[PDB]
C-alpha cells in the first residue's frame, strides 16, 4: 500500500510562515489530484488548496495570495508553502491523494484514493 | 482454495501453468472478485483466461462486453470446443435464436455461464428487463469490458456506445467488473477507471513494454562527419555477435521517404553491408522477393518507409536503426520492437535531426487541420501531436532511454542495468547533446 505523511508543522506566531510537506511513500507513477485539507477544532473540513499531475493549482478564497503548493517532482513529494499566518489558520493540515496510481515494475499496481496522517498547526 | 484455479485450468482449457506470472496474478485477484480489476497485457498475452476462468470457477453469469461481432465470435467458438456454456446475444442471430436466449436467462438455473454481448445490445432498451431480472436474481458474477480503451477519446479506437457501460457498472454494484485492453497512455488507463466506474482500489495487471536485451541510443545527423558511413559501422557493430559464425542476424532501417529508402540501400550496400528496399511504391512481387531474401538472410538487412513495413516479424533482428524521427513514440516503440525478439542482445538506434522534426511537425499540423475541416474539432487533435512530442522529449532528454518509454506507456522504473547509451556513458550523451544546441 501507499503511506502520506506530512510534515513541517508545529506552534508559531502570526504574520509567520511554516511549509508543509506530504511524503507520497509506495510505487508511485502518478497522482490525479493531491488537495490539502484542513481541520480546525470545532468547525467542518475545509478545503486549501490542490495540484493536478501537470502542476494546476487552485486555492480557497481564505488562502489566496498567502499560500502556494508545489511537487518537488524528483522527490515525488508536495509542499504547501503558508506566509501571513492567521489564528483563522490554526488546524490540522493533511493531503487527499485523489487517483493515486501504483505500479511495480513486476506490472503489478493499484488506483486508489489516500489519505495523509496530518500535521498539528497552531497560530498564537 | 487457489486447489480449484489449478484444476479449472486444466480440467477444462488444457493448460498445465499460466503463460506469465502476471496473467496468474491478474487471474487470481479478478476470482477474488473483492475489487474490479484492469488488465493492460498485449494480444496474445492470455487476458481472455483472465475472465474466462474466473467466470466457470464463480456460480453465476458473466456478462462481457465486446465492441464487434468478429471478435466475440473467436473466443465464443473457442469456449464451445472447451464445452463451455458460452452464448452471444448480437444482432447476426435470428429472432428465434435472440428469444430462446433471452429466455434461458429469464429462468432460475440458466444454461448460459458466459454472455458475450455488443456494447450497441447491453445499452439497448429490448435487453434492459432481462438485464434488470438478471440483477435481481443476484445472478450476475462479473462485468467484463473488453477493449476497455475503447471510453477513451484520447485512446484511438473510441466507441461513443462505450459511455453507457460506466453506468451499467454503477447498476450492478454487486458484481467486480473487469477491464482489457491490449494498450494504454496513462491518460486511457485514467479514462477508462473514470468512465467505466471501476471501483477504487482497482487492481492492475499491465504488462511493462521494457525489454533489457534492447540497448537504445541517439545520433544527431547535423553533427555527424559521414552519416552512410556511421549507418554501415553501427549495423556491422551489430551484426556479427557471433564471430564463430561470422556475421550473423539480421536487421532493418526506417526512412520518411522512398527515394531515401531506395538510395540507403544502394549506399549502405556499396559500403559493404548488403540491403534491400522496402517501400508500397514496389509491385507486390518485389516486396514478397525483398522480403523473402531478408527472412532467409540472403540478405542481412532491410531499408522500410515508416508508412510501410514488416510483412511478417522476425526472431534474430540484431538492430532497428531509423534515418529519420517516426510519427509517434508508439511508432518508435513498435518499429524498434521488432528488434531482438528472439532475446540476444540488440541495438535500436534513432537518427535525429531537427530538420527532420521540423519536417514531420508542419506534415502532423497540415493533416490535423485537414481533419479539422473534414469533420471537424475533437480531443484527438491534441494527442496527435502530442504522441509525436513524447519522442522529440525521448532525443533532447538526456536520461535513461528505457525509462522514457516507460514512463510514456505508464510502467515503473525499469532496471535498465547499463542498457542504454545514457545509462553506460551519461556524460557522452550530455556532451553530444550540449553540441546540437551550437548547431541547433
Ligand atoms: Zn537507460
Known amino acids: ?39 480546525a477544532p ?71 484514493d489516500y489519505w495523509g496522517q496530518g500535521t498539528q498547526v497552531t497560530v498564537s | 482454495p487457489e486447489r480449484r484455479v489449478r484444476s479449472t485450468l486444466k480440467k477444462v482449457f488444457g ?15 479478478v476470482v477474488k472478485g473483492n475489487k474490479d480489476v484492469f488488465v493492460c497485457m498485449p494480444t496474445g498475452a492470455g487476458k481472455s483466461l483472465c475472465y474466462q476462468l474466473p467466470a466457470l470457477l464463480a456460480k453465476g453469469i458473466t456478462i462481457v462486453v465486446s465492441p464487434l461481432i468478429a471478435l466475440i465470435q473467436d473466443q465464443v467458438d473457442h469456449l464451445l470446443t472447451l464445452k463451455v456454456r458460452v452464448s452471444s446475444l448480437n444482432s447476426k442471430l435470428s429472432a428465434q435464436e435472440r428469444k430462446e436466449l433471452l429466455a434461458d436467462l429469464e429462468r432460475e438455473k440458466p444454461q448460459t455461464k458466459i454472455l458475450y454481448i455488443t456494447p450497441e445490445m447491453a445499452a439497448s432498451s429490448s435487453f434492459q428487463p432481462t438485464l434488470n431480472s438478471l440483477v435481481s436474481r443476484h445472478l450476475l458474477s462479473y462485468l467484463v469490458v473488453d477493449e476497455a480503451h475503447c471510453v477513451s477519446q484520447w485512446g484511438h479506437d473510441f466507441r461513443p456506445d462505450y459511455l453507457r457501460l460506466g453506468a451499467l457498472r454503477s447498476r450492478l454494484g454487486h458484481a467486480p467488473c473487469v477491464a482489457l485492453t491490449a494498450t494504454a497512455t496513462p491518460q486511457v488507463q485514467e479514462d477508462v477507471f473514470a468512465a467505466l466506474h471501476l471501483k477504487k482500489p482497482v487492481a492492475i495487471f499491465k504488462t511493462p513494454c521494457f525489454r533489457a536485451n534492447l540497448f537504445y541510443d541517439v545520433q544527431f545527423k547535423e553533427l555527424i562527419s559521414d552519416p552512410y558511413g556511421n549507418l554501415k559501422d553501427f549495423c556491422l557493430k551489430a551484426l556479427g555477435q557471433e564471430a564463430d559464425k561470422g556475421l550473423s542476424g539480421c536487421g532493418i532501417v526506417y526512412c520518411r521517404t522512398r527515394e531515401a529508402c531506395e538510395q540507403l540501400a544502394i549506399e549502405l550496400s556499396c559500403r559493404g553491408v548488403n540491403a534491400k528496399a522496402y517501400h508500397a511504391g514496389l509491385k507486390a512481387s518485389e516486396r514478397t522477393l525483398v522480403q523473402n531474401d531478408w527472412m532467409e538472410e540472403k540478405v542481412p538487412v532491410i531499408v522500410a518507409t515508416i508508412s510501410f513495413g514488416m510483412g511478417v516479424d522476425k526472431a534474430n533482428v540484431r538492430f532497428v536503426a531509423h534515418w529519420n524521427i517516426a510519427k509517434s513514440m508508439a511508432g518508435y516503440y513498435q518499429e524498434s520492437g521488432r528488434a531482438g525478439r528472439d532475446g540476444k542482445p540488440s541495438w535500436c538506434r534513432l537518427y535525429y535531426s531537427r530538420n527532420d522534426r521540423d519536417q514531420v511537425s508542419f506534415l502532423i499540423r497540415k493533416e490535423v487541420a485537414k481533419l479539422q475541416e473534414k469533420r471537424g474539432n475533437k480531443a484527438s487533435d491534441k494527442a496527435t501531436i502530442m504522441a509525436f512530442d513524447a519522442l522529440v522529449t525521448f532525443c533532447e532528454e538526456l536520461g535513461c532511454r528505457h525509462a522514457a518509454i516507460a514512463k510514456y506507456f505508464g510502467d515503473a522504473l525499469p532496471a535498465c542495468a547499463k542498457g542504454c547509451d545514457h545509462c553506460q556513458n551519461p556524460t557522452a550523451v550530455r556532451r553530444r547533446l550540449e553540441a546540437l544546441e551550437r548547431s541547433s
Open chain 1, 1 to 39: 500500500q501507499v503511506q502520506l505523511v506530512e510534515n513541517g508543522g508545529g506552534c508559531v506566531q502570526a504574520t509567520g510562515s511554516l511549509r508543509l510537506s506530504c511524503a507520497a511513500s509506495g510505487s508511485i507513477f502518478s497522482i490525479n489530484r493531491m488537495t490539502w485539507y484542513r481541520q
Open chain 1, 42 to 112: 470545532g468547525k467542518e473540513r475545509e478545503w486549501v488548496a490542490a495540484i493536478t499531475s501537470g502542476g494546476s493549482t487552485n486555492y480557497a478564497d481564505s488562502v489566496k495570495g498567502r499560500f502556494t503548493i508545489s511537487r518537488d517532482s524528483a522527490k515525488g513529494t508536495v509542499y504547501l508553502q503558508m506566509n501571513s499566518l492567521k489564528p483563522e489558520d490554526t488546524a490540522v493540515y493533511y493531503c487527499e491523494a485523489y487517483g493515486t496510481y501504483t505500479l511495480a515494475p513486476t506490472g503489478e499496481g493499484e488506483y486508489d
Open chain 2, 15 to 29: 493448460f498445465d501453468s499460466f503463460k506469465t506470472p502476471l496473467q496468474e496474478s491478474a487471474t487470481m485477484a
